[PDB]
Amino acid sequence: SSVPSQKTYQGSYGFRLGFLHSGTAKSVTCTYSPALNKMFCQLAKTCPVQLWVDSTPPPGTRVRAMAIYKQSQHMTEVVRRCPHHERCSDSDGLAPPQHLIRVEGNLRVEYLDDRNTFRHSVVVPYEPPEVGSDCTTIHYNYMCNSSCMGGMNRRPILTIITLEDSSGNLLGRNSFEVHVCACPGRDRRREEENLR
Ligand SMILES: [Zn+2]
């Protein structure tokens, strides 16, 4: 009832998500399944997420990411890191050690513990598409495995990407499921046959 919305809205700017066409080889650290709308990635590795827009949001626009549990009986529970990982210092001195989602390669990164919902989120300033690219790419890191006991503990999660203005007004929203694991390529292949 107080759970964050995961409803898709492209909004004024035609906000869409995009992902690299990376394939499923062993060496891949991040691979996306268009069939599943699901990202398979490695712990603490680079996870490119693309922002596609029909119109450019003004400077000052922010991009927020938040994880929630997929299943209804776990949706009220705040997605956080497991004790083991929250106890180690893989902490970059910006991210709170409890946050599952980080952004790498951005010194303007901002982290939030919601005063009321206790939910974690990470936000970065929106920048217009790179040279030689028609989208804007953000590098996320997931700091726990899906399997991590005492954390997600094999419970499936979604990442909600929100576009908001400098004043916090919602502009658009999208989402994708993510599975954090040692063999992203292997698992994508497996889950894509599981449809059949
Ligand atoms: Zn963990």
Numbering used by the authors: 95 to 290
Please give sentences taken from the publication describing this entry:
In the case of R273H and R273C, it was shown that the replacement of threonine by arginine at position 284 (T284R) restores activity to both p53 mutants. The crystal structures provide high-resolution information on various R273-related mutants including the oncogenic single mutants: R273H and R273C, the rescued double mutants: R273H/T284R, R273C/T284R, R273H/S240R and R273C/S240R, and their complexes with DNA. A superposition of the mutant structures onto one of the wt core domain structures shows that their 3D structures are similar to that of the wt protein, demonstrating that mutations located at the protein surface have a negligible effect on the structure of the protein. Similar geometrical features of the protein surfaces are displayed by the crystal structures of the single mutants: R273H and R273C, and of the double mutants: R273H/S240R, R273H/T284 and R273C/T284R in the absence of DNA. The mutation sites of these proteins are compared with the corresponding region of the wt p53-DNA complex by modeling the central A/T doublet as shown in Supplementary Figure S4, confirming again the inability of His or Cys residues at position 273 to interact with the DNA target. The arginine side chains of the second-site mutations in these structures (T284R and S240R) display a range of conformations in their free state, but a single conformation is observed in their DNA-bound state. Reactivation of these proteins is achieved by new interactions formed by the second-site mutations, T284R or S240R, with the DNA backbone.
The tumor suppressor p53 acts as a DNA sequence-specific transcription factor regulating and activating the expression of a range of target genes in response to genotoxic stress. This in turn initiates a cascade of signal transduction pathways leading to different cellular responses including cell-cycle arrest and apoptosis that are known to prevent cancer development (1–4). p53 binds as a tetramer to specific response elements consisting mainly of two decameric half-sites separated by a variable number of base pairs. The majority of tumor-related p53 mutations, particularly those defined as mutational ‘hotspots’, occur within the DNA-binding core domain of p53 (10). R273, a DNA-contact amino acid, is one of the most frequently altered residues in human cancer (6.4% of all somatic mutations), with mutations to histidine (46.6%) and to cysteine (39.1%) being most common.
